[PDB]
Amino acid sequence: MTEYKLVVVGACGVGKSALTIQLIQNHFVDEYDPTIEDSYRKQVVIDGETCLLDILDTARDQYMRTGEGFLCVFAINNTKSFEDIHQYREQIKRVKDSDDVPMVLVGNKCDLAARTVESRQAQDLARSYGIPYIETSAKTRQGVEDAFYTLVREIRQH
Ligand SMILES: *CCC(=O)N1CCN(c2nc(=O)n(-c3c(C)ccnc3C(C)C)c3nc(-c4c(O)cccc4F)c(F)cc23)[C@@H](C)C1
Ligand SMILES: Nc1nc2c(ncn2[C@@H]2O[C@H](COP(=O)(O)OP(=O)(O)O)[C@@H](O)[C@H]2O)c(=O)[nH]1
Ligand SMILES: [Mg+2]
C-alpha cells in the first residue's frame, strides 16, 4: 500500500483547513483555528490502488522537503488570494529547485455568489504553470475529492 505526501498551501482564509476536513470527515467546518498547522492521514483507494494520504494543512520544513505534491489554494471570492498564488508557487520552486513539481491549482468557495476571480482567469494561470485547475467547495464537497485525487494522479506522472 502506497503513501502520498501532500501539502496544502495558500493565503489565510481560503479554505485550506475546511478542504482538508471535508476530505477526511465529510463535514464542513464553519470556523477552524487559523493557527493550527498539522498533518492528517486518510486511507483511500484511487484507481484500484490502496493509498495512505499524508496531508499537511499549512497555517513544516520536513514536509516541504519530502512533500510530493502541492495544492495551491485560493478562494474565488478573494482576488488577493488568487494574486498571492504566484508567491506560493515561487516558494515551492525554491524549496524543490524545480518548476516541475506536482501541483494542482484549487479555486475554493465555489458555492458563493458573485465570484471575483473568473474560472477563465484561473485556467489561464494554471496553463501558464502547466498544471490542472479544479474548482471546489469545502461547504458542499463539490470537487474536493477531484482536487486531492487529481494531485495524486499528477504525482504519478512524475
Ligand atoms: C490564516 C493563516 C494561514 O493560513 N497562513 C498560511 C501560512 N502562511 C504563510 N505565510 C507566508 O508569508 N509564507 C511565505 C514565506 C514564509 C516566505 C515567502 N513567501 C511567503 C508567502 C507570501 C508565499 C508562507 N510560505 C509557505 C511556504 C514555504 O515557506 C515554503 C514552501 C511552500 C510554502 F507554501 C507556507 F506554507 C505558508 C506561508 C500565513 C499566511 C498563515
Ligand atoms: N462558503 C464557503 N465557505 C468556506 C469554504 N471553505 C472555507 N470556508 C470558510 O472560510 C473561512 C476560512 O476557512 P479556513 O479553512 O479556516 O481557511 P484557511 O485559513 O485556509 O485554513 C471559514 O469561515 C470557512 O468556514 C467554502 O468552500 N465555501
Ligand atoms: Mg487553516
Author numbering: 1 to 59, 68 to 166
From the paper:
Ras GTPases are involved in proliferation and migration, and their aberrant regulation is implicated in cancers and developmental diseases, termed RASopathies.
To study whether other small GTPases also exhibit a targetable SII pocket, we first turned to the K-Ras paralogs H-Ras and N-Ras, which exhibit sequence homology in the SII pocket but differ in position 95 (Q95 in H-Ras and L95 in N-Ras). Both H-Ras and N-Ras can also harbor G12C mutations, which have been validated as cancer targets in pre-clinical settings. To study how the difference in residue 95 affects the binding pose of an SII pocket inhibitor, we solved the crystal structure of sotorasib-bound H-Ras(G12C). To study whether the effective SII pocket target engagement in H-Ras(G12C) and N-Ras(G12C) translates to inhibition and cellular activity, we characterized a small library of 10 compounds that were initially optimized for K-Ras(G12C) in biochemical and cellular settings. Both N-Ras(G12C) and H-Ras(G12C) exhibited markedly increased thermostability in their sotorasib-bound forms, as tested using differential scanning fluorimetry in the presence of SYPRO™ Orange. Sotorasib inhibited SOS-mediated exchange and significantly reduced the rate of EDTA-mediated exchange in both N-Ras(G12C) and H-Ras(G12C).
